[PDB]
């Protein structure tokens with residue numbers, strides 16, 4: 208967490224971080240690679256009422272819309288649960304829900 | 308004639324002797340006709356009396372006599388002494404005949420398990436009825452005998468010639484005991500194998516509380532009562548449709564095991580929570596606008612008025628029915644409950660499989676079990692058996708005419724002084740009341756300090772292996788019914804394997820070396836070997852599959868071969884091969900079966916003619932082809 212090991216391994220490590228460098232890649236944690244409970248906690252800081260209830264309905268819709276629109280082997284409309292890491296657009300979620 | 312010293316000053320109990328022998332060794336003191344044996348744990352260095360030391364602080368040749376028992380009139384050796392040693396008595400070393408007779412017995416009830424340290428020729432006899440009635444436990448350091456001793460006990464006690472109708476059960480979390488009993492024991496696991504059944508616990512074999520304590524986390528609202536209400540009609544509805552003997556509507560209790568389909572409840576319960584209502588205020592299901600879980604879509608919101616704030620558990624429960632890790636519970640293959648609630652069988656077969664099998668041992672390896680709900684399940688397994696034997700004590704298959712012996716692995720994580728689970732309450736109940744129902748108890752744990760103080764004390768006999776930490780020793784040393792200052796000062800230095808047996812299951816507490824079981828019959832756990840599995844050179848892994856398995860929640864690839872035959876031959880046992888798909892099947896010891904893919908059969912012929920198995924297989928197959936082990 209202090210980022211004090213990258214100096215030890217000159218060319219034996221693959222150091223990831225926030226600020227990209229000449230040869231050190233940038234740590235990337237795809238936001239759609241998260242389970243439903245964790246995603247709500249990281250972004251919204253914790254919803255309890257209808258908002259927590261409503262968002263999941265929106266997440267379910269989008270991950271359904273992507274599946275009908277693209278092929279993922281094995282997953283169907285019955286085998287799909289909200290925490291299957293299938294990509295969806297956060298921008299569409301915020302924009303549509305907020306615009307409406 | 309190793310004369311050491313003779314008594315010269317008797318002051319009631321703290322005798323004194325003037326002089327002219329292992330620590331845990333008895334002593335011989337003949338008095339006229341009766342021989343006195345006991346543990347003189349104080350001799351020499353610590354035995355020198357502080358009072359007289361000022362005269363000669365340079366020697367330690369004093370012994371204080373306080374016996375354990377006396378030899379009868381040519382009959383036997385029994386605890387207590389009718390007289391105490393006096394002036395003129397001389398102490399010798401005990402002899403082999405004395406050891407034979409002191410530990411010897413004419414009673415067939417006892418059983419020989421281990422051997423004494425002095426001369427292994429002596430067999431260590433231990434009661435079997437006390438062992439199964441007065442309860443017991445095994446303690447020791449993580450590097451001590453522990454699991455190697457318990458297997459020896461169960462293997463000796465489970466001998467068919469002497470006990471053709473033994474009946475015991477074992478709980479293992481690492482699955483480390485199956486290998487010791489290759490084909491002598493019924494071993495059930497979650498991930499089934501070729502010769503292993505499914506360790507299945509029908510969820511409807513639970514009381515309302517236990518069921519509410521696994522799939523809901525302890526709902527504490529008005530909605531909680533509704534589930535108890537909701538299950539009641541479902542369990543009531545099944546009673547009307549299918550007739551069961553002995554129970555009617557009047558005496559129905561929500562905690563009685565009557566079959567019900569958990570599928571129906573959620574589909575009915577959740578559906579009534581969200582749905583469009585054609586007529587405002589109409590809660591009937593006919594105003595809304597089954598084989599598969601897929602719920603039909605509905606128009607946007609009115610909302611059904613028959614619902615509550617249990618929306619989160621409902622969506623929480625549905626998830627628990629999806630993942631295959633719980634398939635042992637909610638999708639019991641034969642005990643799968645249909646839509647109408649009628650199952651294929653009843654629990655009698657389940658009990659028959661668990662305990663009614665002709666084999667003595669029953670093993671439930673829980674390694675693959677999720678660790679979050681392990682404790683809850685343990686309480687479930689103890690509870691069900693008791694009510695099976697408590698209501699069948701008079702019947703000829705109960706615990707009175709066929710006593711049980713439940714064995715628990717690493718109990719100390721479930722007998723916490725402040726534990727609030729179901730295992731401790733279930734275990735405590737057996738200890739208090741299982742006595743007269745023929746239900747024993749053996750506990751295994753590497754850290755008794757966490758075990759509840761009350762629960763540990765009532766244990767009959769304790770097998771005390773080596774203990775290093777000073778916290779556990781004192782805790783055990785305080786819960787010993789018949790303990791000796793000569794035998795318990797040695798606990799933290801016992802060599803591996805050997806244990807100490809103390810309690811009411813033996814005439815005397817003795818330090819025995821439990822006999823190791825035959826090689827090839829030992830408790831083994833097949834954990835990955837990093838040193839061997841990292842030493843091999845790199846391979847271009849194909850991570851595209853690792854994602855599909857993770858997404859699909861499966862563990863088997865689509866590229867597996869099932870109907871390939873095998874023929875018997877480092878220690879290669881069996882091998883297959885197929886030119887149709889160039890798939891090679893290989894089998895080694897311990898049931899390990901790989902399948903190396905994309906392999907020409909030219910090597911197959913070479914391997915058969917190589918006649919150099921073990922040293923030649925690794926030459927061109929170990930790290931040269933893609934394999935998906937099975």
Ligand SMILES: Nc1ncnc2c1ncn2[C@@H]1O[C@H](COP(=O)(O)OP(=O)(O)OP(O)(O)=S)[C@@H](O)[C@H]1O
Nearest residue numbers: 448449450451452453454455483803804821822823
């Ligand atoms: N009678 C014995 N003679 C020689 N070695 C023994 C004997 N008993 C045990 N051992 C050795 O010491 C090891 C102790 O480890 P285990 O037998 O696996 O027991 P444990 O690990 O303490 O208990 P768990 O339930 O597996 S954590 C054994 O694997 C043996 O190598």
